[PDB]
């Protein structure tokens, strides 16, 4: 490129917005236009020791080319001698994770609204053959109007044709097919959505156990129950998303038309 490239000197850095595994995400303002955004920092030495350099590249290439109202925007990136920087769209209201600690549980209206935004977001993603694979409260942010925005494409992949073999994601959200050493596809995000919907309503993931081994066991068996306040419609939906057989889980278009979703969304 013969064009001016990004540089750290281009942004005034503000306070930290969050703590990531390989560095913090700071609020920031581009100096010439005063546009407010978020700066995700990654320390290169940490990335090298972890051997996650190829996943960083997939995060950047996949997220930067995605364009949707409920997916966090990746404007660009730049690296220097010790770290790598992602120029992200600023999410003003924080994470759904934080809102979930505060409210402890989400009522049905709030839960269906979020599921709907996320389901629309995932549908657009799949139409591009991208599988997120790390859907969870800490990766869901809130925009200026309280609208959900999917973020963190760290474990994402572009799967045009073939299935995948990677185990990746968060323990409580892992799909059975991954744990069991089987191949997987975009249906893993449908499982994540069921896990996520349950957590929104109950306040905790359905397979939470005291050890790693016990959680693997419960996911593989799809062992969980609902507290008494979870209505019939929510149970019908989560039960359909949480099918051991990936083929039997609903399409995102079905979730969006689910009676419970349309009545409360």
């Amino acid at each position: 490129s013969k064009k001016r490239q990004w540089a750290l000197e281009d942004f005034e850095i503000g306070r930290p917005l969050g703590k990531g595994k390989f560095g913090n995400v700071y609020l920031a303002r581009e100096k010439q236009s005063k546009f407010i955004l978020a700066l995700k920092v990654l320390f290169k030495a940490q990335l090298e020791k972890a051997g996650v350099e190829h996943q960083l590249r997939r995060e950047v290439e996949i997220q930067s080319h995605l364009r949707h109202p409920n997916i966090l925007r990746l404007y660009g990136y730049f690296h220097d001698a010790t770290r790598v920087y992602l120029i992200l769209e600023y999410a003003p209201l924080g994470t759904v994770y934080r809102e979930l600690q505060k409210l402890s549980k989400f009522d049905e209206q709030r839960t269906a609204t979020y599921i709907t935004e996320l389901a629309n977001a995932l549908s657009y993603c799949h139409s591009k053959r991208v599988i997120h694979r790390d859907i969870k409260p800490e990766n869901l942010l809130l925009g200026s109007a309280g609208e959900l925005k999917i973020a963190d494409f760290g474990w994402s992949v572009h799967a045009p044709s073939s299935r995948r073999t990677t185990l990746c994601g968060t323990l409580d959200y892992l799909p059975p097919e991954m744990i069991e050493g089987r191949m997987h596809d975009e249906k893993v995000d449908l499982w994540s959505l069921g896990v996520l919907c349950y957590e929104f309503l109950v306040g905790k993931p359905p397979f939470e156990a005291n050890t790693y081994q016990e959680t693997y066991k419960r996911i593989s068996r799809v062992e969980f129950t609902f507290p008494d306040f979870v209505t019939e419609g929510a149970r019908d939906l989560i039960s359909r998303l949480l099918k051991h057989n990936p083929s039997q889980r609903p399409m995102l278009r079905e979730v969006l038309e689910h009676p419970w979703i349309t009545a409360n969304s």
Partner: peptide, 29 residues
């Protein structure tokens, strides 16, 4: 190596990309 097929050019924030996926899926060799 930190050379990614993604944007790195300075942008003027005051003043259709997703085809990249299918176009890369359809390319041959």
């Amino acid at each position: 190596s930190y050379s990614y097929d993604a944007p790195s050019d300075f942008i003027n924030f005051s003043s259709n990309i997703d085809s990249w996926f299918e176009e890369k899926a359809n390319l041959e060799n």
